[PDB]
Amino acid sequence: YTFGQ
Amino acid sequence: YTFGQ
Amino acid sequence: YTFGQ
Amino acid sequence: YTFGQ
Amino acid sequence: YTFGQ
Amino acid sequence: YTFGQ
Amino acid sequence: YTFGQ
Amino acid sequence: YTFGQ
Numbered sequence: 001y002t003f004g005q
Numbered sequence: 006y007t008f009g010q
Numbered sequence: 011y012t013f014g015q
Numbered sequence: 016y017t018f019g020q
Numbered sequence: 021y022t023f024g025q
Numbered sequence: 026y027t028f029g030q
Numbered sequence: 031y032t033f034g035q
Numbered sequence: 036y037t038f039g040q
Contacts, residue, residue, distance in 0.1 A: 003008045004017025004022070007019025009014045009022025009032070012019070012024025014032025014037070015030045018023045022032045024027070027034025029037025034039045 001006045002019030005010045007012045007017060007022060007024030009017030011026045012022060012032060012034030013028045014022030016021045020025045025035045027032060027037060027039030029032030032037045
């Protein structure tokens with residue numbers, strides 16, 4: 001799980 | 006699990 | 011688990 | 016920049 | 021910059 | 026577990 | 031800059 | 036700068 005912003 | 010901003 | 015900002 | 020694995 | 025594994 | 030800011 | 035593993 | 040393992 002990867003969340004990038 | 007990775008969260009980056 | 012990695013949280014970066 | 017976010018790199019997750 | 022966030023690198024997680 | 027790593028938290029960085 | 032955050033590096034976690 | 037945070038490095039965690």
